[PDB]
Each structure stands twice: as structure tokens, then as C-alpha cells.
Amino acid sequence: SDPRLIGCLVRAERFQLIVERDVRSSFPSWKELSMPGFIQKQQARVYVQFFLADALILPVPRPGQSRLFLLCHK
């Protein structure tokens, strides 16, 4: 929730890595699972997940009207 962490430094030690595979194939039957000539389209997608508490926040040491409202739905 905190927007203070914008433009800062983060260090983590236990973060999971996830890669998503998308394949568009035209395999005729089960027997042809051996030969590799039946693949047409390929793709990839990578992102990183980790709990913030286990990580460490480190600020970057680079050398008036307001109102209160409560969010209900986005």
C-alpha cells in the first residue's frame, strides 16, 4: 500500500522465479511426441515474487493543500 517506496532500493534473499510457457502446436497424435518438427509458435514470460517482510528496504541517499478520502472500490 505504501507509495513511499517509489524510486528506492530493495534487497531480497528468498525470492521465487516464475516462467510461463505458451506453445501453439499441431501434434497429430500421441505417437509423434518424439520428433520435434511439430512446433510453430513459442513465447516466454518472466516475473519475480517475494514477501516484502523477508526482504530489506534501503533508501536512496541522493544528495500545500490536502484532503482525506477512503477508497471503496477500484
Partner 1 sequence: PSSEQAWLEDAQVFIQKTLCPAVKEPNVQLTPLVIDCVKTVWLSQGRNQGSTLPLSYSFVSVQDLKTHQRLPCCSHLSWSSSAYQAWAQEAGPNGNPLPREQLLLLGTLTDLSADLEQECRNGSLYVRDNTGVLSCELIDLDLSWLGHLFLFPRWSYLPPARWNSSGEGHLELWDAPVPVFPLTISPGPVTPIPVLYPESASCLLRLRNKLRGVQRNLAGSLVRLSALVKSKQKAYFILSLGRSHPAVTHVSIIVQVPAQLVWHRALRPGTAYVLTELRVSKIRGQRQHVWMTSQSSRLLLLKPECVQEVRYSRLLSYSGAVTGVLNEPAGLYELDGQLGLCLAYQQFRGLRRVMRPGVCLQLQDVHLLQSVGGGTRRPVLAPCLRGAVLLQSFSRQKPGAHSSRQAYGASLYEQLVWERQLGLPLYLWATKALEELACKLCPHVLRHHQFLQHSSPGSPSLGLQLLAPTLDLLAPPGSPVRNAHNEILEEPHHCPLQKYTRLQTPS
58 sits near partner 1 (criterion: CB under 8 A): yes
Closer residue to partner 1 (CB): 35 or 60: 60
User: Which lies closer to partner 1 via its Cβ, residue 8 or residue 39?
Assistant: 8
What does the DSSP 8-state code read for residue 32? G
Question: Could you tell me how many residues of this chain bind partner 1 (CB under 8 A)?
Answer: 9
**What are phi and psi for residue 33, nearest 5 degrees?**
-65, -15
User: Please, which of residues 6-45 interact with partner 1 by CB under 8 A?
Assistant: 9, 11, 13
CA–CA separation, 52 and 12 (whole Å): 8
Residues 6+ apart with CB under 8 A from 14: 50, 51, 54
Residues of this chain that bind partner 1 (CB under 8 A): 9, 11, 13, 56, 58, 60-63
